[PDB]
Design a binder for this molecule. Structure first.
Ligand code: NAG
Ligand code: NAG
Ligand code: NAG
Ligand code: NAG
Ligand code: NAG
Ligand code: NAG
Ligand code: NAG
Ligand code: NAG
Ligand code: NAG
Ligand code: NAG
Ligand code: NAG
Ligand code: NAG
Ligand code: NAG
Ligand code: NAG
Ligand code: NAG
Ligand code: NAG
Ligand code: NAG
Ligand code: NAG
Ligand code: NAG
Ligand code: NAG
Ligand code: NAG
Ligand code: NAG
Ligand code: NAG
Ligand code: NAG
Lengths: 112, 451, 125, 132, 132, 53
């Protein structure tokens, strides 16, 4: 299997400052059909999960012009520009290029 | 009247074109462990049975004198000959002075044909030399100014290569096949002069077995006619065009070399050897060829009878020998088991024809340093062959020529010719033509496409 | 069985039934080391160009294909009666050979190019 | 709804499945037939031979009625003398490898005049169009 | 009448014109994709590569439902590349060279919804419809 | 007086003084239209059926 490492674990973010996280993989995520499968999931407390960024650097449904991601291979980052109060929860990175589907560690974001 | 364009694909339409053909070789002798100068490892096996398709109501036009197959065959044969002499010994250190003397011993009278020469030759070790002797023909040595000083005839033009001793010069049949999208048309008209419309056109998959036989002034082991003796020329009025004759029945010729040779090997370097004639045991006699007198006279009479039609009705037909030139164009040159002969065809073309168990012995000469394909700068040094050689062949053609006539009639003299190898294969690739299939056509029907 | 090019002297009515025989014979499978390697590539390229030309028209995978172009440019000056029963395919190419470049362009502009456009604007609705 | 690449049976990945399940994965084996001095001619010869061999199947699909199609059905009847079997024991209890060795010496009859019935469908169609 | 020949745009002539104009000259650029020992092997290899590229393109155009058509419009909704430009400012105010720069990396997820949900689902239902 | 052992068979080339004889791994791949099958059995002995392919 392929393991995922998320750095950092707890990221205190001021309400209105830029923030950035990271996720890394032990193997290349490139697939035979020329795609890289990375999913960024927002896990708000007591609410349904949300897909923020799919396919490394492509915006999914919703995501009101705030979240964006970038990365080439085995090193990916997520960027938030104007952090609001609703962006509190856990963030996970999941692969899809090889079974089993392995999630990430986690990154708790709280208002400081 | 409601007529619209209709497209048909696969219609039987062909046009003249030129392409590159490939091999087809019989598997009977394909698997043997004998190397030939004409390669077989690069030629695909032939089909077990040919596919002959007859065409009705088809009348095509052929031309034997403007065929690209002859040129392609010439190029392939030259390339094969050039490629067959690469991997083995080159005779560069043989350009030394010689001390040659007359052989004598048993001379039937071949007085000065053979020479006993001695020279200095290098050995396997770089700093040592050896003294050896060898026998050379008179046609290979040239005097440079009793033991006189001689030298090889090629030591001022090019250092050449020794003939590979593992290969053979025996011709084998070769089939030429057209690629996909191309067809071969075969004229089956028995009385066809090679040029003009052919009534019997027949689609043939490939060609038959064509043996690449190299000879001058005569055609050996060719294709016989079916009805009568056929005379074919590009322009019978012009006197600068060769005339090709095809025999109805073949005459027999036997050739031999009475001398019993002995081949010795001399090492001239590391892994390189030179083959020389040491001694001749027995008696020394001239090489000769014979032709039956009566059969040759009947064949010549038939040739005269079929040649009378084109020229006149009361003119006399005269046969003479060659005019002059090099030794390869004034003599019947061929190959018998690996030894190259140059026979005197002067007792054959000697007659005068009026409208109103003997044998003919032809003296021959043998040469070891040859230069063929009319090129300059390359040899093919044939090594000596041990024993006595014999050959039985067929004469199935002639290559005649005409001189500048005088008084416009009353005499026509024909003498043998040759020199070009394309005329040897024009006599066999004369019923074949290559065409290119065009399958797309348009014709008016009354379809209207549903809208 | 007539074989390859069997109906070469037969009339047009009997030669159009054997198109399959000549259709499959257009694609079959250092001296003699580069001869085949250059002949087969040309044999493939000659077939591919014809199959693309037959298909930039409306005739993609059919051996007999009849369209809706009027018989104006190609001046046969002869009626259907004595064409399909009194002429062979070899004689036809001798008559219509000058008009085979101004009839290959009326099949690409007046047909299947315009025709493909009202269909694109009719499945719109 | 965006796509995960882990749900993808690779090349020949349904070679052990039944015939009714391996028939939905034809594209994977279909796309692999056309991918990409001495020791520089043999590779070129192999590539040329691979190109002209794929075309001989597309030409064979040019005749019949299956052009540019992977699953195509015809109107050629099947007699019980070929494979006397039901539809519940061929498509649900047999592999494509096991079917190509049972119907193996009966394929030249099927591939030939029985399925080249389009000649009876191209002359039966141009006659209908020539009637208005 | 007309007797001039300068109006012919030629190969790649309509490369700066809009979408509505460049769509009527597809046949001109469709022709030039198929035109016709050291050095000998170099040129021969180039011919093989050109043929392979054309064959791969024609196989892709045909794994979908578009077999032998130059303009072929399908049954997939437009959400794969969320370009908010509407129909009026694309087909009249833009060229193909700018469209190719616009949808340059949203082009592998369109090629996967045309061979899975467009043709593969359609031919399965059509086969099942005649099966009944 | 001595001589080299090859002087009656051939005169052969010296080894290039810059090349090395150290082996390096080489992988073999299959062309288009073909495939390579690998037997994953642990007690395989060459000839015989392989149940893990
Ligand atoms: C040639 O000369 C050598 C001496 O150099 C002699 O031994 C040999 O017998 C001679 N050969 C003939 C055929 O006379
Ligand atoms: C060979 O060389 C020797 C000298 O080493 C000389 O005496 C002899 O005459 C030479 N033989 C010839 C030229 O035939
Ligand atoms: C060959 O025969 C044809 C008759 O079909 C004739 O027209 C032509 O002149 C002949 N060729 C020669 C060189 O006489
Ligand atoms: C044939 O020879 C005659 C006489 O020399 C000449 O006038 C003529 O041009 C030649 N060629 C033909 C008839 O094609
Ligand atoms: C020729 O000489 C060899 C010995 O070298 C002998 O075996 C053979 O019988 C001789 N041939 C004739 C015809 O005497
Ligand atoms: C050639 O030899 C054969 C025997 O092999 C003989 O029958 C024939 O008559 C000979 N030919 C001549 C012209 O002597
Ligand atoms: C030659 O004369 C004979 C009669 O003596 C005749 O049969 C033949 O046709 C003539 N040949 C010609 C005129 O070419
Ligand atoms: C041809 O015969 C004459 C005799 O009339 C002779 O002088 C001449 O040398 C011979 N030419 C050839 C090449 O045999
Ligand atoms: C051939 O024989 C003739 C006379 O029979 C003679 O003059 C000539 O020198 C011989 N040789 C050649 C090559 O012609
Ligand atoms: C032709 O034969 C006659 C009679 O035998 C003879 O006198 C004459 O010399 C021969 N011609 C040649 C060139 O040898
Ligand atoms: C035999 O040849 C001679 C030539 O020397 C000739 O005069 C004679 O007529 C020929 N015999 C026959 C029967 O033709
Ligand atoms: C020579 O011709 C005869 C027919 O007269 C034939 O039987 C024989 O095989 C031929 N010899 C060859 C082709 O070597
Ligand atoms: C060939 O021509 C003859 C003569 O007109 C004719 O009777 C025959 O029918 C033709 N062949 C075919 C196959 O039509
Ligand atoms: C139709 O026929 C007329 C008659 O000359 C010709 O001028 C015109 O160019 C033809 N139409 C086409 C499209 O070629
Ligand atoms: C149709 O073609 C025939 C020739 O077979 C001709 O006689 C007739 O006049 C043509 N009809 C018209 C209307 O041109
Ligand atoms: C078509 O053009 C060629 C070349 O100018 C000409 O020879 C031919 O006669 C033309 N076709 C017709 C039917 O006039
Ligand atoms: C192998 O057979 C079993 C039967 O229980 C089936 O469940 C499984 O899917 C098959 N393997 C594959 C790869 O289809
Ligand atoms: C059904 O078709 C096959 C075709 O090979 C044939 O062998 C069999 O006899 C046929 N059965 C019939 C016609 O009843
Ligand atoms: C097929 O199934 C039916 C019942 O559904 C059964 O009667 C028949 O025997 C089966 N066929 C075979 C070959 O077993
Ligand atoms: C099909 O026929 C061939 C004929 O050679 C035979 O070898 C093979 O065993 C047959 N297949 C079966 C499944 O019996
Ligand atoms: C080039 O641009 C100008 C202005 O934008 C426009 O008027 C013209 O039509 C364009 N050229 C073409 C061929 O459309
Ligand atoms: C459908 O459109 C949405 C909106 O941009 C997009 O997020 C989604 O990825 C699209 N679906 C597919 C399968 O690409
Ligand atoms: C396209 O239509 C009008 C015309 O530009 C525009 O106002 C509208 O916003 C566009 N549609 C969408 C969905 O953006
Ligand atoms: C190209 O891919 C990169 C990610 O590698 C992405 O950021 C960019 O938006 C893509 N470009 C387009 C035009 O889709």
């Amino acid at each position: 299997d392929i393991v995922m490492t998320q750095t950092p674990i707890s990221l205190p973010v001021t309400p209105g400052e830029p923030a950035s996280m990271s996720c890394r993989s032990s193997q290349s995520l490139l697939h035979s059909d020329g795609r890289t499968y990375l999913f960024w999931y927002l896990l708000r407390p007591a609410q349904a999960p949300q897909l923020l960024v799919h396919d490394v650097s492509k915006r999914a449904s919703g995501v009101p012009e705030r979240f964006s991601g970038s990365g080439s291979d085995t090193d990916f980052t997520l960027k938030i520009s104007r952090v609001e109060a609703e962006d509190v929860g856990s963030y996970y990175c999941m692969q899809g290029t090889q079974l089993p589907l392995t999630f990430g560690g986690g990154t708790n974001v709280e208002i400081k | 009247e409601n007529l619209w364009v209709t497209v048909y694909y696969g219609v039987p339409v062909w046009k003249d074109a030129e392409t590159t053909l490939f091999c087809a070789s019989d598997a009977k002798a394909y698997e043997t462990e004998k190397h030939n100068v004409w390669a077989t490892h690069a030629c695909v096996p032939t089909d077990p049975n040919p596919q002959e398709i007859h065409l009705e109501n088809v009348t095509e036009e052929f031309n034997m004198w403007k065929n690209n197959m002859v040129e392609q065959m010439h190029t392939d044969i030259i390339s094969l000959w050039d490629q067959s002499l690469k991997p083995c010994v080159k005779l560069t250190p043989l350009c030394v002075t010689l001390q040659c003397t007359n052989v004598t011993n048993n001379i039937t009278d071949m007085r000065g044909e053979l020479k006993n020469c001695s020279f200095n030759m290098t050995t396997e070790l770089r700093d040592k030399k050896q003294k050896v002797y060898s026998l050379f023909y008179r046609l290979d040595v040239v005097q440079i100014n009793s033991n006189k000083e001689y030298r090889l005839i090629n030591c001022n033009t090019s250092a050449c290569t020794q003939a590979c001793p593992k290969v053979s010069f025996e011709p084998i049949p070769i089939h030429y096949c057209a690629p996909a999208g191309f067809a071969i048309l075969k004229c089956k008209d028995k009385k066809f002069n090679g040029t003009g419309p052919c009534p019997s056109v027949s689609t043939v998959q490939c060609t038959h077995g064509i043996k690449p036989v190299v000879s001058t002034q005569l055609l050996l082991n060719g294709s016989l006619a079916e009805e009568e003796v056929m005379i074919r020329s590009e322009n019978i009025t012009n006197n600068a065009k060769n005339i090709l004759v095809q025999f109805n029945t073949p005459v027999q010729i036997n050739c031999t070399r009475p001398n019993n040779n002995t081949r010795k090997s001399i090492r001239i370097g590391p892994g390189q050897a030179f083959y020389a004639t040491g001694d001749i045991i027995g008696d020394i006699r001239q090489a000769h060829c014979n032709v039956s007198k009566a059969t040759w006279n009947e064949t010549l009479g038939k040739v005269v009878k079929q040649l009378r039609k084109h020229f006149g009705n009361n003119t006399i037909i005269r046969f003479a020998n060659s005019s002059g030139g090099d030794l390869e164009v004034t003599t019947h040159s061929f190959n018998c088991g690996g030894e190259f002969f140059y026979c005197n065809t002067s007792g054959l073309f000697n007659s005068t024809w009026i409208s109103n168990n003997d044998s003919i012995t032809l003296p021959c000469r043998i040469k070891q340093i040859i230069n063929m394909w009319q090129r300059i700068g390359q040899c093919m040094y044939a090594p000596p062959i041990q024993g006595v050689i014999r050959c039985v062949s067929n004469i199935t053609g002639l290559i005649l020529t005409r001189d500048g006539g005088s008084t416009n009639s009353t005499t026509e003299t024909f003498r043998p010719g040759g020199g070009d190898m394309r005329d040897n294969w024009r006599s066999e690739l004369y019923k074949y033509k290559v065409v290119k299939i065009e399958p797309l056509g348009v014709a008016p029907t009354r379809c209207k496409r549903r809208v | 069985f007539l074989g390859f090019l069997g109906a070469a002297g037969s009339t047009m009515g009997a030669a159009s039934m054997t198109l399959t025989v000549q259709a499959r014979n257009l694609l079959s499978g250092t001296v003699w080391g580069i001869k085949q390697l250059q002949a087969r590539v040309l044999a493939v390229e000659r077939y591919l160009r014809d199959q693309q030309l037959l298909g930039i028209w409306g005739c993609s995978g059919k051996l007999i294909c009849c369209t809706n172009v009027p018989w104006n440019s190609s001046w046969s000056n002869r009626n259907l009666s004595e064409i399909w029963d009194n002429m062979t395919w070899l004689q036809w190419d001798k008559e219509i050979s000058n008009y085979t470049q101004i009839i290959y362009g009326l099949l690409e502009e007046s047909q299947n190019q315009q025709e493909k456009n009202e269909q694109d604007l009719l499945a719109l609705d």
